[PDB]
Design a protein around this ligand. Structure first.
Ligand code: NI
Length: 341
């Protein structure tokens, strides 16, 4: 049964609620982004209207084979009417095609559902600036002050400078980057750009990337692994055994691997600066875990909420334990007392 925090009161609507069967009273199913914990349940047999971004609707049609007649893509930053209710989709600064949803209820209540997001001051000048928001359905993934990480730009700087150094010292080194979902494409695209290579990958991953409207993409990716010196592999293969095996397959073209695992947060964050990150090494294989996050840090989240000043917060992440829930509620009250709303 669908949990309460996936239901939008005063509407026929649900958000990211595809694994519960037919939800009683739901006239339109919204999908914030194409990550499996959120789309779980969709397939070619789904026959209700699904509302989403253009990019998400490309992925629904091509990857999950949802039929066209049930996909309702909406433009961003544009007032639209759905089953009699005004909605707006906003960029969530998450993965490609990920949105936040503003709902303008018939009784005057305004609700923001962030989906998954990485808060940013740029959001303070979107259409959110223009009216009051009463209820916030909030991505609370890293809602605790231990969760600090660097900007995306600092992390990409580290990665480019590390890859360029290694390959210039050894033109026979291969770079490998791990992936298991869409998101974080900047990691592998920025490294391939500095090296003058295309990124090589499986046919299944190339297909996914071709749904993303990324400019000039035919220029940056390929299925011809032999012509590429940056390869993408499944995240599970980014270990010494998996990498040794891959290196065997390249037929003596390469004699070293430098590999990257873009994790979110790891407790190496609580002690070490990005400048100071070091790899794990075995023989001619090195693996770097880099803290490239597509969710808000604690401070980014706090800033967003203290700017928005909502009347009520509904967490959508870490809701399964009483300790988590009590922790989050304590921080929400601190924020409200410090800011004065
Ligand atoms: Ni996500």
């Amino acid at each position: 049964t669908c949990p309460f925090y996936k239901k939008i009161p005063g509407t026929g609507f649900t958000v990211d609620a595809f694994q519960y069967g037919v939800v009683e009273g739901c006239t339109a199913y919204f999908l914030t982004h194409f990550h499996s914990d959120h789309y779980a349940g969709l397939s070619k047999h789904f026959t209700f209207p699904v509302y989403c971004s253009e990019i998400t609707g490309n992925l629904l049609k091509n990857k999950l084979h949802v039929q066209e007649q049930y996909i309702h893509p909406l433009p961003l930053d544009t007032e639209c009417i759905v089953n009699g209710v005004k909605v707006v989709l906003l960029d969530a600064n998450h993965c490609p095609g990920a949105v936040m949803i503003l709902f303008y209820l018939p009784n005057g209540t305004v609700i923001l559902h962030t989906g998954d997001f990485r808060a940013d001051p740029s959001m303070e000048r979107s259409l959110l600036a223009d009216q009051k928001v009463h209820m916030l359905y909030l991505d609370t993934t890293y809602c605790s002050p231990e969760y600090t990480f660097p900007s995306q730009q600092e992390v990409i700087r580290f990665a480019i400078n590390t890859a360029f150094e290694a390959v210039t010292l050894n033109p026979h080194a291969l770079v490998v980057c791990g992936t298991y979902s869409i998101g974080k494409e900047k990691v592998f695209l920025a490294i391939a750009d500095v090296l003058g290579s295309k990124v090589g990958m499986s046919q299944e991953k190339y297909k996914t990337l071709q749904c993303l409207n990324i400019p000039e993409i035919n220029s940056l990716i390929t299925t011809d692994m032999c012509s590429s010196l940056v390869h993408l592999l499944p995240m599970m293969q980014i270990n010494f055994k998996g990498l040794q095996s891959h290196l065997k397959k390249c037929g003596g073209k390469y004699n070293q691997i430098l590999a990257f695992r873009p994790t979110g947060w790891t407790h190496s964050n609580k002690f070490t600066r990005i400048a100071d990150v070091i790899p794990q090494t075995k023989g001619n294989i090195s693996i770097y875990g880099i803290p490239y996050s597509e969710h808000s840090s604690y401070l980014e989240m706090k800033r967003f909420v203290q700017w928005l000043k909502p009347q009520k917060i509904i967490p959508t992440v870490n809701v399964g334990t009483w300790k988590s829930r009590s922790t989050m509620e304590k921080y929400f009250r601190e924020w409200k007392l410090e800011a004065g709303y």
